[PDB]
């Protein structure tokens, strides 16, 4: 693949030709078809959420939105996937432009408002790869389902409900998406209050599937929250045994410091601008579950040492997106080569043991 064609030559010069939108939908084109430019070592191996996973490297959601370039996700070395926000009905989203690119910044801002092509679409997709996708998650290559909910639904709980048992058969793990930012209301369900009634109900329908179709149910959080409704989430999420957390969605602050000259659009904020307050996070959450809740850290990974900081903090995985928007396929194999010569080097017999160390040492 060639890690310095592609970060100084191929996506420099496809920034300079189309839009991020445009780029984002050739890239999942591209990927479907399997038209890509590293092998797993033991010591990238996890087991977490009742799952083994051959690398702690996943694609976060919003690239694969509809679930179409899976397979070619696996193929392009991600650990694991987890295919972007599908909501219960079909909807097209904000209006364009909806996405910005902050180079100066390494760092994007986007308002898609959970564009879907729906439930229904997206289990005939999945179903059709069912088996093969059995398959591969023996293999050590689970799939993650991320939900969200309509623009005019009045039931939010119904929304997930109903994304809980329509996708939930088809997936390793869910995700109850309560932190997009581009949904008006839906952050104020990760209230106390409203979230302990909406996991219940989640947590209720997920119980109801056969054993074999019952995935591990996820919350992701925003970047975003007071220290109060981090505690309040983890009171929860113990409460009802919430089975993990993917920590810190886009943000909504803006960073002193940033460039970008569209730094001002509205949006959730994501990039190496969003590394840190992700990381802290995933720290904070961390030791308000007693690192006893595995949790997926996503936020700004684009090298070894990033995926490292966050596994450190307490995440048993991480995820990446922007990362892959600036530097190309490529970095996904660079950010594994790194993770394991750093683990070497700090003295961790794999993954699974630098795991929360920071909170150890
Ligand atoms: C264009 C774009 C679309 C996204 N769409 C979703 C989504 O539908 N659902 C979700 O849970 N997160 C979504 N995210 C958030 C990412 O999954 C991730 O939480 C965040 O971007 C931080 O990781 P990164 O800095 O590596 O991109 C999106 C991010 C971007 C940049
Ligand atoms: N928002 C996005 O998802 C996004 C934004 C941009 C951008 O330039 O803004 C670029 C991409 C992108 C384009 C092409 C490839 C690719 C795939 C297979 C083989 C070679 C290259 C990967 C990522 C995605
Ligand atoms: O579809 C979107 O706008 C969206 C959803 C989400 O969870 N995060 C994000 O940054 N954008």
Same mark, same amino acid.
């Given at each position: ?7 100084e ?17 050739l ?16 010591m990238?191996? =996890? +087991? *977490? $959420? @009742? ?5 702690p !490297? ?8 509809? %679930? ?5 996700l ?12 599908v ?6 989203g904000?209006?364009?432009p ?25 289990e ?5 790869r ?25 039931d ?7 994304? =809980? +048992? *329509? $996708? @939930?058969?088809?997936?390793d793990?869910? !995700? ?6 581009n949904?008006? %209301? ?20 997920r119980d ?29 999420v ?6 993990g ?5 886009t943000?909504?602050?803006?960073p ?11 949006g959730?904020?994501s ?11 995933? +720290?904070?959450?961390?030791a308000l579950?007693?690192?006893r !809740? ?11 040492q ?34 394991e ?17 920071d909170?150890?040492?």
């Open positions: 693949g060639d890690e310095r064609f592609y970060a030559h191929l996506m420099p010069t496809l920034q300079g030709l189309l839009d991020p939108e445009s780029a984002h939908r890239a999942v084109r591209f990927t479907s078809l399997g038209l890509l430019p590293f092998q797993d070592s033991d990238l191996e =996890v +087991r *977490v $959420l @009742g799952h083994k996973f051959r690398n !490297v996943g694609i976060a959601a919003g690239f694969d939105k509809h %679930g179409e370039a899976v397979d070619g696996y193929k392009m070395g991600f650990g694991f996937v987890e295919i972007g926000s909501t219960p009905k079909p909807q097209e904000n209006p364009r909806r996405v910005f690119r902050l180079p100066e910044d390494q760092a994007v801002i986007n308002r898609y408002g959970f564009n879907s092509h729906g439930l229904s679409v997206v005939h997709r999945l179903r059709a069912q088996q093969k996708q059995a398959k591969l998650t023996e293999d050590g290559l689970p799939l993650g389902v991320n939900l969200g909910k309509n623009k005019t639904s009045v939010a709980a119904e929304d997930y409900a109903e994304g =809980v +048992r *329509v $996708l @939930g058969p088809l997936a793990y869910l !995700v109850v998406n309560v932190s997009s930012p949904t008006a %209301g839906l952050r104020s369900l990760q209230g106390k209050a409203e979230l302990r009634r909406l996991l219940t109900k989640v947590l209720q329908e109801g599937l056969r054993r074999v179709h019952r995935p591990a149910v996820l919350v992701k959080i925003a970047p975003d929250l007071t220290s109060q409704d981090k505690e309040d989430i983890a009171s929860v113990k409460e009802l045994g919430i089975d957390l993917i920590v810190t969605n943000t909504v602050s803006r002193a410091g940033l460039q970008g000259a569209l730094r001002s659009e509205t959730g904020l990039g190496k601008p969003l590394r840190d307050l992700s990381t802290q996070t995933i +720290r904070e959450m961390y579950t007693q690192g !809740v595995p949790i997926i850290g996503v936020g700004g990974v684009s090298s070894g990033d995926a490292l900081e966050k596994i450190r903090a307490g995440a048993s995985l991480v995820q990446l997106y922007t990362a892959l928007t600036f530097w190309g396929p490529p970095v996904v194999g660079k950010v594994k080569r790194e993770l010569a750093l683990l070497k080097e700090q003295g961790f017999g794999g993954v699974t043991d630098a795991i929360g160390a909170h150890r040492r």
